[PDB]
Design a protein around this ligand. Sequence first.
Ligand SMILES: [Ca+2]
Ligand code: NA
Length: 260
Amino acid sequence: GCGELVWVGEPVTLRTAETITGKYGVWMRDPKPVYPYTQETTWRIDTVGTDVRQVFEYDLISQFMQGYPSKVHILPRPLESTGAVVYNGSLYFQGAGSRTVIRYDLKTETVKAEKEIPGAGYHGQYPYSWGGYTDIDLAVDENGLWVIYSTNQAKGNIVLSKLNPETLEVEQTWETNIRKQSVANAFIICGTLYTVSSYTSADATVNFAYDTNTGTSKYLDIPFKNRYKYNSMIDYNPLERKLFAWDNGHMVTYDIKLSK
Ligand SMILES: [Ca+2]
Ligand code: NA
């Protein structure tokens, strides 16, 4: 059941990174899991540093909250920033120093697809407001796989493309009127793009919504809390209907409420 976002809860901390490379990262579960994985499987990637290659996998959530992975994946290309997602058994991530998105099948540990996001800025061209080479942000919603980015054609405004999750073909593209480097991050719920105003401020809000079904933006003012004052990653999981985030070394979730 879809609808408009009207409320975001307080962040709930599941794990605190004790590593020296854990200030920024991405952690996720598969909204459409495939055998032998389940909806409990969790993946973690610390992304501070160069040559980011390790992906920690946890079959059980207990293993995840205790920090003991059941398997470790070594990525075929070094990874960039915090925008990656897992979907349909594959990790989708951006190759370091490129605009290339890579589909990495987790079970076979092989690359199934590689595609340049056409015209996408990369490596600090159109990042989110905190920088960190966040130019390219993948997203999964109820409709499948998306990528959030910007281009010179769009003059730095957020662009959205719906992707074939198997071939990474661009199926459709939307150009919004929201400057990407002016927001802290973004995520998609039920075909609507939502942006967060600040990654550190105490008075942060979800401040814009762009509906791909109509091609229009609207103002929002929903309180959004950055408890640890450096939210480097905010994504939406459509199966759990929660936000997943990585705030200054803390892997957190946010409850949400949708309308209609
Ligand atoms: Ca995001
Ligand atoms: Na993402």
